[PDB]
Design a binder for this molecule. Structure first.
Ligand SMILES: Cc1cccnc1-c1ccc2nc(N)c(C[C@@H](C)C(=O)NCCC(C)(C)C)cc2c1
Length: 370
């Protein structure tokens, strides 16, 4: 899938985007790739932050659905007008599909001042689409209307410019080393998975595994951090604090309130521990583990920011996790594959890893239910 390698760009902390076209004639836009939402939404008005925007008056293939959509968030909103139009991905498969598009006509704290993207591509499932699950997401339209296989994969390589690959309809085996290991998609809404054990430098946190997935755990290209449920975060920080105690840092650093700096090329990587998440495997009583380095969770802003944070919406495996691995969203088989990424950032002593099989009992008890 050589045509698709290196089709993602971004700025550190501003997300990864892919080039798309909308309308006839085609209008080029940069679009955030977001596996934690399910709407395709593009700027359609001259917001001063935007390089460009969708001009529906210029598209002969635009169809109005005569319906509004309002999407609030914890901080901010976007609102817009629903339609369909022809959509393509220049460095993607050689197809064009009629997709739902939310034309964003009012927003708050959505667009980023200085960013180079103008819309968002929600790759998750219809259940979490707005206004409701009747609004077919882009990828569902792509699969229904073409012969593109029902899978995509992401290699996110971690303002400094970032890059990566979104392989639509397949897997590029050059982007990873070792084998892929698969964890089930527990339910098709977010890309929900189940974490069954957590270790800091090989030391088990020893929490009830239900805590790790309270109230869900998800794989999310739209989130920068590794977000953890509050109880798990405090246990995790307590352990990471202890593991790196040969140097002391202000309390505020662990809470993301401040940076920590060293002289150029003398960051003490080795004093910081690795973080392992064991995921539910394909077989009964079988798990595997993925392991990340401080190079993943200490993010440059040589000064760095702590990129693990507490959450009330569950564990969110964002870029901190994803930049370690090639991640396969195998929708056809309701599973997510992880392999060591050929592009991940590491040092001479440690590398990110994916290892198995391990024996883990009572994994079904780790999932949260109402
Ligand atoms: C909708 C919105 C308005 C203003 C600012 N941000 C957003 C927004 C857009 C896409 C997002 N995509 C994400 N993956 C996330 C994190 C994720 C765990 C999450 O909360 N997903 C639900 C996203 C939503 C369905 C658009 C509300 C947050 C998002 C927030």
């Amino acid at each position: 899938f050589v045509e698709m390698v290196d089709n993602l760009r971004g700025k550190s902390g501003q997300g990864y985007y892919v080039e798309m076209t909308v309308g006839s004639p085609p209008q080029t836009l940069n679009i955030l790739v977001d596996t934690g939402s399910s709407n395709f939404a593009v700027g359609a008005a001259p917001h001063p932050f935007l390089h460009r925007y969708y001009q529906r008056q210029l598209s002969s293939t635009y169809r109005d659905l005569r319906k509004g959509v309002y999407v609030p968030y914890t901080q901010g909103k976007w609102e817009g007008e629903l339609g369909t139009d022809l959509v393509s991905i220049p460095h993607g498969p050689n197809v064009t599909v009629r997709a739902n598009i939310a034309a964003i006509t009012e927003s708050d704290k959505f667009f980023i001042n200085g960013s180079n993207w103008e819309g968002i591509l929600g790759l998750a499932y219809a259940e979490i689409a707005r206004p409701d699950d009747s609004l077919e997401p882009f990828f569902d339209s792509l699969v229904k209307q073409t012969h593109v296989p029902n899978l995509f994969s992401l290699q996110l390589c971690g303002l400094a410019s970032v890059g990566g690959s979104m392989i639509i309809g397949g897997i590029d085996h050059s982007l990873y080393t070792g084998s892929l290991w698969y964890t089930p998609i527990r339910r098709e809404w977010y890309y929900e998975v189940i974490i069954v054990r957590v270790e800091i430098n090989g030391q088990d946190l020893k929490m009830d595994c239900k805590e790790y997935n309270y109230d869900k755990s998800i794989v999310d290209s739209g989130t920068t951090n590794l977000r953890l449920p509050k109880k798990v975060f405090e246990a995790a920080v307590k352990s990471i604090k202890a593991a790196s105690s040969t140097e002391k840092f202000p309390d505020g650093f662990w809470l993301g309130e401040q940076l920590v700096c060293w002289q150029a090329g003398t960051t003490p990587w080795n004093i910081f521990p690795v973080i392992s998440l064991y995921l539910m495997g394909e077989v009964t009583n079988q798990s595997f583990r993925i392991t990340i380095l401080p190079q993943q969770y200490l993010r440059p802003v040589d000064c760095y920011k702590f990129a693990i944070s507490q959450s009330s919406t569950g564990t969110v495996m964002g870029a901190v996790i994803m930049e370690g691995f090639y991640v396969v969203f195998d929708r056809a088989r309701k599973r997510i594959g992880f392999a060591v990424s050929a592009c991940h950032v590491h040092d001479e002593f440690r590398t990110a890893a994916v290892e198995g099989p391990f024996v883990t009992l009572d994994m079904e008890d780790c999932g949260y239910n109402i």
